[PDB]
């Protein structure tokens, strides 16, 4: 089938191959049902003398076709992208052993866990900080969209925070190239969370840069609420009727009107009525001036 | 889309509806990336006076289309099956609140966790016990197959152990009816673990009762090793080449020849060269005589 072709084809880019003997794996940083990200250290990694701390993504022993395909897909995409706010691939291990992805280590972990820790007990997160984060992410999406690449899974859990509070879009296992037709379409049910998908993605299984914009709107919401849960208290299965009747999330207690207006814009029913990521950056910049 | 139709159609069988006010939810018994099973207690459940202890399956807040569809699918199947070795549905809550599935509580939990606990520190599991378990499960599959229902996810983690060590096949979210064409076919990548799928399911995405037989073979293996990991040390992505070149798992240190021969039979390349569940029961019965 399609996956076995990809697996066999993978066997036959030496630039990205790292020797397993140079890699030492540490504690788990995060897990899922079929795969996990682990802390690791790499000896003589790409012209860097000595050991370099890194993150490593792998499957679990009981991984499925879907999870395997996602890993192969994430590697394939990451080889093509270089941007300050997109996570950086170093290489992979696939010869004699489990497939491992090696990326630059992100100091503070996911943006969601970072924001939620921030609301407890060196410096407190200001509004200007939150706007800075959104803008950094907006810039990265402006880069991806300009390559006609759709992420399909924008969410605070899928953004990483590195040294000096720099945003890193991660988790590219579901992203697709849409150069030809400008849309990606999945016939079966996605493995993307209901509460983050756009109305046309949820109902029609249609994914575009403009649907990425919708997800960025929910991401704006997570940020402003310091890691809140979208549509709080509402069951995911109710989103169909709720969105189809024109309902949207309400303004968070700690959210400016200017920011909420942007959220609502990202959530327009007509996908072309939504702003593009270039507009979002421009909007966010005006907010800090 | 297909899911939204199912969601709307669900709104409009009163026999299975339980009042949420009669249900108290307890601790988590098991979790996944998009859903969990919880311990619960039900007041006046189906003609049973007072409180009844039960298990409840629900989604998590960030559930996806796939996970929602699986829950709706599991409920729909469970309404149709009644068997001593198939888990028993009591009802569901879907009005004003999150969808919840209510089933009979299983004392010792999953068969995998039960077998693994058994290999530590009232009575020890004998060989006769393990053969008894396989036979109980074989009987349940003989019931499902006779209804032309394919489980698609036979595994020790998906079997439950109730009072008096009685086996209960669970997790029917992926099972499909195959009355018409005798085969179910998935165009996209399954969410079933690689190491449990049959050679034609893994490569060709083809699922039948005979592929259920293949999975029962791996299940036989888990049991005999008291919850061992299939193809130990071998990366899932290597299963394609390994199975296509005719390799199979070797005989476990604590496994009789008679039992291993059955495993090998379940693992024949030609699906019709495999035994049917009626033969497996007969084989297992001869083993205890
Ligand atoms: C400090 O915590 C973390 C640090 C991380 N640093 C880098 N990558 C990660 N994840 C990653 C790596 C490769 C691919 C991919 O999609 C995601 C990390 C995850 C962490 O925690 C979960
Ligand atoms: C004592 O532990 C457990 C007891 C359980 N008892 C019943 N059902 C369960 N699971 C269930 C319920 C409904 C549908 C379905 O597919 C699975 C259980 C799970 C447990 O642990 C995970």
Numbering used by the authors:
A (entry chain A), B (entry chain A): 700 to 711, 714 to 822, 843 to 1010
Q: What does the primary publication say about this deposited structure?
A:
RET (REarranged during Transfection) is a receptor tyrosine kinase (RTK) that is required for normal development, maturation and maintenance of several tissues and cell types. Gain of function mutations in RET are implicated in several human cancers, e.g. medullary thyroid cancer (MTC) and lung adenocarcinoma (LAD). The identification of these mutations and rearrangements in RET which lead to constitutive activation, together with convincing preclinical data validating RET as a classical oncogene, make this kinase an attractive target for cancer therapy. Our initial focus was to identify novel, low molecular weight, ATP-competitive inhibitors of the RET kinase domain with improved selectivity for RET against KDR in cellular assays, relative to 1.
Of the first swathe of approximately 30 simple anilinoquinazolines prepared, the most interesting observation was that phenol 6 resulted in a significant gain in affinity towards RET. The boost in RET affinity from the R2 hydroxyl group may be rationalised by consideration of the hydrogen bonding contacts formed in the gatekeeper pocket. Initial modelling of 6, subsequently confirmed by the determination of the X-ray structure bound to RET, highlighted a pair of hydrogen bonds from the phenol to the side-chain of Glu775 (the conserved glutamate located on the αC-helix) and the backbone NH of Asp892 (from the conserved DFG motif). Comparison of the X-ray structures of 6 and 1 reveals that the ligands share very similar binding modes. The quinazoline core binds to the hinge region (Glu805-Ala807), with the anilino ring enclosed within the hydrophobic pocket between the gatekeeper residue Val804 and the catalytic lysine Lys758. The anilino ring of 6 binds between the gatekeeper Val804 and the catalytic lysine Lys758 and, in comparison to 1, shows a small rotation towards Asp892, with minor re-orientation of neighbouring side-chains consistent with the formation of hydrogen-bonding interactions between the phenol and Glu775/Asp892. The most substantial structural change is the displacement of the phosphate-binding loop away from the ATP binding site in the X-ray structure of 6; this may be a consequence of a degree of induced fit in the ligand binding site or may simply reflect the inherent flexibility of this loop. Modelling of 6 in various published X-ray structures of KDR suggested that the hydrogen bonding network around the phenol in RET may be less readily achievable in KDR. This is a consequence of KDR X-ray structures displaying a conformation in which the αC-helix is displaced away from the ATP binding site in comparison to RET. The associated movement of the conserved glutamate located on the αC-helix (equivalent to Glu775 in RET) would likely compromise the formation of the pair of hydrogen bonds to the phenol observed crystallographically in RET.
